[PDB]
Amino acid sequence: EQDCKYWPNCANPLCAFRHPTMPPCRNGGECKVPGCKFTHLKTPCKFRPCTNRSCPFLHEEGQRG
Amino acid sequence: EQDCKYWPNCANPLCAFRHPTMPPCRNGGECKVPGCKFTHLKTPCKFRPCTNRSCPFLHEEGQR
RNA sequence: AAAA
RNA sequence: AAAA
Ligand SMILES: [Mg+2]
Ligand SMILES: [Mg+2]
Ligand SMILES: [Mg+2]
Ligand SMILES: [Mg+2]
Ligand SMILES: [Zn+2]
Ligand SMILES: [Zn+2]
Ligand SMILES: [Zn+2]
Ligand SMILES: [Zn+2]
Ligand SMILES: [Zn+2]
Ligand SMILES: [Zn+2]
């Protein structure tokens, strides 16, 4: 099985590539909420600053705007 | 299991051949960076010259 | 076939 | 449901 490279933005409802079971965490990859089992991305967010407050990508300290 | 001939350009989601865990090295198969453990492709690059500064395929001194 |  |  190969990972879908488009997830969490895959537009093919019949995509045969691997999608994580759990939806992406809307707190971002840097989510520190205890017990949160949503999928936390490891891919860094490309926006500087990022102003999407439901961005699932991984942010550094100060990257949020 | 044998290696995938098509990786990193394998479009078969059910591909049985093994795909390396590490992504291809952005420096190309000719990478000389010490300690670099990204996957260094062996198959040569067709583009003469390559224009992709992140082509993972193997180049030569006069393929810039 | 998700605009480099 | 296709990353500003
Ligand atoms: Mg694109
Ligand atoms: Mg197109
Ligand atoms: Mg868009
Ligand atoms: Mg886009
Ligand atoms: Zn997909
Ligand atoms: Zn979370
Ligand atoms: Zn972001
Ligand atoms: Zn393959
Ligand atoms: Zn390398
Ligand atoms: Zn090349």
Measured from the Cβ of residue B27, the count of other Cβ atoms closer than 10 Å reads: 17
Which is nearest to A20 in space by CA: A36, A45, A35, A41? A41
Residue A57 has, within 13 A of its CA and on its CB side, a CA count of 17
What is the Å distance from ligand 9's center to B27 Cα? 6
**Domain residues of chain A, as ranges?**
1-65
The experimental resolution of this structure, in angstroms, equals: 2.2
B10 — contact with chain A (CB < 8 Å)?
A: yes
Reduced 3-state DSSP string for A16-62: CCECCCCCECCCCCCCCCCCCCCECCCCECCCCCECCCCCCCECCCC
Which is nearest to A48 in space by CA: A32, A34, A59, A35? A59
Distance A54 CA to D1 C1' (A): 15
Which is nearest to B23 in space by CA: B36, B12, B32, B13? B36
Distance B32 CA to C2 C1' (A): 35
Pick the CATH number of A1-65 from 3.40.140.10, 4.10.1000.30, 1.10.4080.10, 3.20.20.70: 4.10.1000.30
